[PDB]
């Protein structure tokens, strides 16, 4: 529909509305307007760098090579992806996010060196 | 190890810890603060664009077709990557950096044109 159009909807119905939300991230007053705008640009750049160090740069969707440790969550695919909202999902896995990010970065690093070795083989 | 930790370490050792150094890259008091912050953002954008026009977007590490020239360094590979620090390397090639960038950019442009031509070859 629009910005946050499917925020309360099922998981998949939100999964193909990412473009709108991704696109809509961009004196007494002049200094404050500048502060807000530069805070926004810093946030966008941090998100872009976090994606880039995982190899998913330029793609809203992506795929990785870390196994999903069920300790973070054990719900099967149908329960998550047909009977749940994105806010509930972020609430559920809040603690583990950091760990996930770390593993993701590490996986990319390992993968990357492997790739270089392949490009080194004659 | 943490920020700049491998700076005094071997080339090979520091070449495994690029992310730790990449993520840490990024009333008058507010004025100077915003000037510094925008300068840092613009410098990160310098580097990001300069990698983007080199075909190396979103990869911390990237190989390219431009061949080495023994004039730039008469150096055995083992010396470079297992004996000599990064700072000494940046110092040694500080003269020739611009020609490397120019050749690299030209090669990337030629590669893009060839890729476009190949994709249309049907």
């Amino acid at each position, epitope marked *: 529909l629009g910005f946050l159009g499917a925020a309360g909807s099922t998981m998949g119905a939100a999964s193909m509305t990412l473009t709108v939300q991704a696109r809509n991230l961009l004196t007494v007053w002049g200094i404050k307007q500048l502060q807000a705008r530069v805070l926004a640009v810093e946030r966008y750049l941090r998100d872009q760098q976090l994606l880039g160090i995982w190899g998913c740069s330029g793609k809203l969707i992506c795929c990785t090579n870390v196994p999903w440790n069920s300790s973070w969550s054990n719900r099967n695919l149908s329960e998550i992806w047909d009977n749940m909202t994105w806010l509930q999902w972020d609430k559920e896995i809040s603690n583990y996010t950091q760990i996930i990010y770390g593993l993701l970065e590490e996986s990319q690093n390992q993968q990357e060196k492997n790739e270089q070795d392949l490009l*080194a*083989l*004659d | 190890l943490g920020f700049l930790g491998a700076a005094g370490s071997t080339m090979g050792a520091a070449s495994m810890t690029l992310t730790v150094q990449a993520r840490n890259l990024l009333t008058v008091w507010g004025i100077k603060q915003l000037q510094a912050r925008v300068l840092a953002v613009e410098r990160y954008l310098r580097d990001q664009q300069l990698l983007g026009i080199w075909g190396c977007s979103g990869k911390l590490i990237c190989c390219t077709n431009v061949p080495w020239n023994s004039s730039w360094s008469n150096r055995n*590979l*083992s010396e470079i990557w297992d004996n000599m620090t990064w700072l000494q390397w940046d110092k040694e090639i500080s003269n020739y950096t611009q020609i490397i960038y120019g050749l690299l950019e030209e090669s990337q442009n030629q590669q893009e044109k060839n890729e476009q031509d190949l994709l249309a070859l049907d």
Partner: antibody
Amino acid sequence: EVQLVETGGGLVQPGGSLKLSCRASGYTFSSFAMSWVRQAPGKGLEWVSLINDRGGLTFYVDSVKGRFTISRDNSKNTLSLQMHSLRDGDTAVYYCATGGMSSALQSSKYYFDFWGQGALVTVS
Amino acid sequence: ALTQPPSVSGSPGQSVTISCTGTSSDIGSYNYVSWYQQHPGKAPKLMIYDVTQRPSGVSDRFSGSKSGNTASLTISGLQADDEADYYCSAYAGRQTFYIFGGGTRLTVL
């Protein structure tokens, strides 16, 4: 001077499986690729598999793509290869050997520096 | 596989040569053709690597060269200690990493 020794089953039955192990000592095992090569009891040598130093990549001849799997522990300085559903052509002496490919960062090698005593494998 | 002579013979004091030849894809493209020695029933040993480079601790009598699709290994002196089988080892790019030829016999009188 590096000691490169091996151990593994010598006799097996067709359709089974085995695991060869290799122990190396006298150098930096973490900075050197490894490779499993075989020589039939009367015939010449034949490359089997090649493994990078970091123990992340794998390479095999087309014969045993889905049957062999080679791994390596770096801290304990050890290599291993598990053969599954082996056939009779595998009856041969298997040698461990360093080298085979450098790690993209030191001098290209493309050979086999050290050679261990080998181990014979036979199947009924 | 590669193609090598089955055997060679020679007396001490002279020199002999062994050839190894294959497809143009491997020998012609890449100058990576090593030579290994295997004494009877003993562990093989690496005699030559690349096309000419000599390993540490290997006598000068061993030498090598590449010409087009062929690669030759020349032994001089022939002190009769190297009464061992010789093999060539050619690198053939990706998906075909190392290939060898028929085992060569070096006879010494």
